Amino acid sequence: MTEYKLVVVGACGVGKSALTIQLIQNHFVIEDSYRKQVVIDGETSLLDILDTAGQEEYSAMRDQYMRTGEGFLLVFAINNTKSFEDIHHYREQIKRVKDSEDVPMVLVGNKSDLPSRTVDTKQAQDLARSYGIPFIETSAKTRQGVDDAFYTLVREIRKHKEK
């Protein structure tokens, strides 16, 4: 089977852990990684997901863990404008460690189940279009779009590996 190293990044409290746990265990709730065997478009895939946590620091060991990622989920929360404005920073750090302008990534607007949204869908769609990447709205609470976010990311890695 093909293994894919995925990293989930984004601002404090956006739901990076809740998204990973919902994917792995189908439940709603320190840095660790989680493995899950899945079938995507008929191909059995082993997803190895790093749920980013800890302090902001740029040691060689921190860069080496992040560089291990083949694709990244850039997560913001639809009710947190600051988390959306922080997406640029996370994308910047991914391109730096991967040393490439072309890295598989998916923009994820999480907490779509909450009312009182502050980031409009159109604004996130236009940003993703500028980056040349997919945008998916998710809810780790109701599971809406969770599988679609990780599977779309695997499809982006496949597109990158084929080219």
Ligand X SMILES: Nc1nc2c(ncn2[C@@H]2O[C@H](COP(=O)(O)OP(=O)(O)NP(=O)(O)O)[C@@H](O)[C@H]2O)c(=O)[nH]1
Residue from 84, 110, 127, 151 touching ligand X (CB under 6 A): that is 110
Helices and strands (H, E) in the chain, number of each type: 6, 6
Which CB sits closer to ligand A1B7P, 57 or 162? 57
62 binds, among Mg ion, ligand A1B7P, ligand X, none (CB under 5 to 8 A by kind): ligand A1B7P
Give the nearer residue to ligand X in terms of CB position, either 91 or 158.
91
Pairing of strands 43-51, 2-10: parallel
Q: Show the tokens assigned to 93.
A: 């750090």
Size of the site for Mg ion (CB under 5 A): 3
Q: At what angle do helices 16-25 and 146-162 cross, to 10 degrees?
A: 90
Report the partner that residue 139 touches, choosing among Mg ion, ligand X, ligand A1B7P, none (CB closer than 5 to 8 A by kind). Answer: ligand X
Applying CB under 6 A, which of residues 140, 149, 154, 157 lies at the interface with ligand X? 140
Question: What whole-number distance in Å separates Cα of residue 33 and Cα of residue 39?
Answer: 20
Segment 42-101, which members bind Mg ion (CB under 5 A)?
53
Which parts of 41-87 are beta strand (E)?
43-51, 71-77
